[model samples]
Each structure stands twice: as C-alpha cells, then as structure tokens.
Target: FEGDLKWHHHNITYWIQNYSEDLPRAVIDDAFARAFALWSAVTPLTFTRVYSRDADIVIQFGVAEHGDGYPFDGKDGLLAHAFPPGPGIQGDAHFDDDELWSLGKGQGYSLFLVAAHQFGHALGLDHSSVPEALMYPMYRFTEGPPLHKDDVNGIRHLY
Candidate 1:
C-alpha cells in the first residue's frame, strides 16, 4: 500500500541547501525546478524556491554519514533519499555527492530524474511496483515523460 504521508499545505517551498560540484549551478537549479514541476503538474500541490530561510523541503548533496541516520553509500550504490512530509528533517532530500550528476541522459545519473523520484517520496509516495512508474525502486533512464499513469494516479490519490 502507498504511504498515507503527505504535505498538509498545497503551496510548498524548497531550498537547495547545497549543490553538487559535478554540474553547473544553473543546470542544477533548472533540474530541480523541472523535477518539482513534474509533481505539481499532476497534483494540486505547488512548489516555490526559497532562500535565506528554512523551507518545507530542504535539498542537499552529501557523502557518507552526512547527518541523517540514513548515510548514503558512495557512488551508484545509493543515488539519493528523501523523508516524508512532516516537521524538521522531514521532506528533505539528500543526494550522494559521489555520483556524477548529469543534466540529462548522459554519462552520469540524471539529476532531474533522480530528484523527481526523491520528491515523490518527499510528497509521501512509496515505491511503485510498475517498472515504468517514476516511483519505481530502480532508476531507469527514459526519453519520454518521466511519470507513468501509475505515478499520476498515486500523486492524485495523495493530494
């Protein structure tokens, strides 16, 4: 069953606490913007970028044992993780800095795809059994729209 967890508010804010050196800042910024847009497009939720204050969603790139108990394994082993909506630490998404992040389907992992997946979790979605779904456990690169019908249904059900 999909987790019942979800953000209480329709308008949500996110802050990029840090950026990975692998990609240019503008590219990373655009990636996150697009990632959030994917979810907001289907659900009633709206995401805004905020700075100089705590946001509903905090995004950062970290290595082994950053802060949260869920320390990411180096490189391709664990790309990223996010918490369900709640208070502090919740709704924060962390990426492993060791991985080479790419803007699109290139030499490294796609930041937009991974961030989109992590944000789904941040919005209270569990892994989907459908392989084509964006919430699937494994990461698969696709040129088509990232969200499958299952993903749209899942977010709609939550929001």
Candidate 2:
C-alpha cells in the first residue's frame, strides 16, 4: 500500500520538545517553522507550534537508540526519520543530533531541508518516485521552493 496514510485533522499541533545544541534554539525553531510553512502552503493541512510535549506532532533530536527502536548512526548515515500519523510516537520527527545542523549554504546538511522532508512523512506522504520531489529519500539542498509538483499533488490528494 506504500502506507497511504494521512492525518484525520486539518489543524495539527507540533511540539519541539528537544532542541539541538549544534544550533541555537531560535535557529532550529525558525528552520522547523519554515519547514512546516512549506507544507501548509500547498494543502488544507496547517501546523501550529506548541511548547507542550503533548501535541499531534513531536519534534526532537537524538542519537543511537534514543527511543522507538530507531537508533541513529553517527555522522552521515540515517540523518533523520519520522513516524506517520496515528497516536503516541505517531507523527513524531527525530533528527540525528550527530549531524551538524546548519543554516548557511553548504555549511552542512540544511536543517530546513531535512525537517521539510521528515515532515512530509509526518503528514502522511511517502517517498516520491521523482528525485526532484521534496519527499524524495535522499536529501538535496536547494535555494528554490521546497515542494515539487509531485509533493503538492500528493498532499492535496490526502488533504
């Protein structure tokens, strides 16, 4: 089924319970917030950032078996992962704290880029067959719009 999943709610709340020391709280927050904005732009789905640990979506950074049996390998491998919408850990997004989260171009893997990609999963979208799609499995840094036509159509299909 490629897990044709989706959030049943139009308005979703997300909590950034954990922050990465690699970047300042404000930077991480801004990156993630922008990431959410990219998705919300194309669909009826909307996201609100909450300080509460209890929210429809949870965001955190961890390394090596932080929880959910998804242990992150150090450095380059397994950058981040997200759960599809449901309950509990569902819709939670985890970034590997080992990676250097940066905002500068070519500084490191862009947090905005990865977070946007992970949020795609959280929003019930699967990896796209087109590499140009934001939901593509591999991360690519771009100054252009984050979403491709495939991504917009995919989210619109669900929402």
Candidate number of the best lDDT: 1
Candidate 1 per-residue lDDT over residues 90-109, each given as its tens digit: 88899999998986666889
Against the reference, the lDDT scores of all candidates come to 0.90, 0.87
Worst window of 10 by summed lDDT in candidate 2: 1-10
Q: Pull out the clashing pairs in model 2.
A: 65-71
* Cα distance off (Å), candidate 1, residue 101: 0.4
Q: Write the per-residue lDDT of candidate 2 for residues 1-159, one digit (tens) a residue.
A: 135568788999999988888889999899999999998898877889887867988999998889677799989879999988888888899999999889748667899989999988988888899988888888877778989999999888888
lDDT for model 1, please.
0.90
Question: What does candidate 2 score on TM?
Answer: 0.95
lDDT of 1 at 51: 93
TM-score of each: 0.95, 0.95
Model 2 regions more than 4 Å off: 1-4
In model 1, how large is the Cα lDDT of residue 113? Answer: 97
